[PDB]
């Protein structure tokens, strides 16, 4: 009986979640006419 | 035994986008009125 060996201790480990998502702009705006009526150009 | 075999020949290519594209008409404006009542002619 002769085995392969290995003697467990605390190791740090900072694996964390990971986790879904969506990505979006910042930066995420819009252009909305606050002046009403025909765009000419 | 012999085999048949093809030397190389890369360096000529031509890769694109294909697909269907949605086009859309360059200026539509539907006309919405500047102004209410009723519609004579």
């Given at each position: 009986?002769?085995?392969?060996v290995?003697?467990?201790?605390?190791?740090?480990?900072?694996?964390?979640?990971?986790?879904?998502?969506?990505?979006?702009?910042?930066?995420?705006?819009?252009?909305?006419?606050q002046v009403?009526?025909?765009?000419?150009?």
């Open positions: 009986p002769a085995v392969g290995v003697t467990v201790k605390t190791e740090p480990l900072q694996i964390t979640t990971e986790l879904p998502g969506r990505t979006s702009a910042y930066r995420i705006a819009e252009v909305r006419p009403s009526g025909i765009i000419l150009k």
